[PDB]
Design a protein around this ligand. Structure first.
Ligand SMILES: *SCCCNC(=O)[C@H](C)NC(=O)CNC(=O)[C@H](NC(=N)N)C1CCCCC1
Length: 116
């Protein structure tokens, strides 16, 4: 019931990020070009729960980029705090919101695989 809960917490996180990615790729979004000009930071390594601190630190720019077009941001925040309860090392190369979301979706799938 503890491992399952953790798994469910990650599943919601995964889905939340996907919903953001979907709303950005919707042809109804009139600000995709502007959104892509935003710069996001990515962790050098992303293989451990504690690395979610790196995601948490970016929720602000995340909210701002989406606001260009939240109930989801807050949901992510809650999950993240539940998973990691660490000093992040970020890569030099910044990423677009699309790359940023992909990377974390991939991180979620990885961790979910591990604890199943
Ligand atoms: S590389 C910045 C390109 C110029 N555009 C912006 O600054 C726009 C308005 N906002 C963003 O790109 C959002 N990203 C951030 O706020 C960045 N911080 C984090 N990702 N944590 C900072 C942008 C400004 C330079 C330092 C990073």
């Amino acid at each position: 019931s503890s491992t399952k809960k953790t798994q469910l917490q990650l599943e919601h996180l995964l889905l939340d990020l996907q919903m953001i990615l979907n709303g950005i790729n919707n042809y109804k979004n009139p600000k995709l070009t502007r959104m892509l000009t935003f710069c996001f930071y990515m962790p050098k390594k992303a293989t451990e729960l504690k690395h979610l601190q790196c995601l948490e630190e970016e929720l602000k720019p995340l909210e701002e980029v989406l606001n260009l077009a939240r109930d989801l941001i807050s949901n992510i925040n809650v999950i993240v705090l539940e998973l990691k309860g660490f000093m992040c090392e970020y890569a030099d190369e910044t990423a677009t919101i699309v790359e940023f979301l992909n990377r974390w979706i991939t991180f979620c799938q990885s961790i979910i695989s591990t604890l199943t």
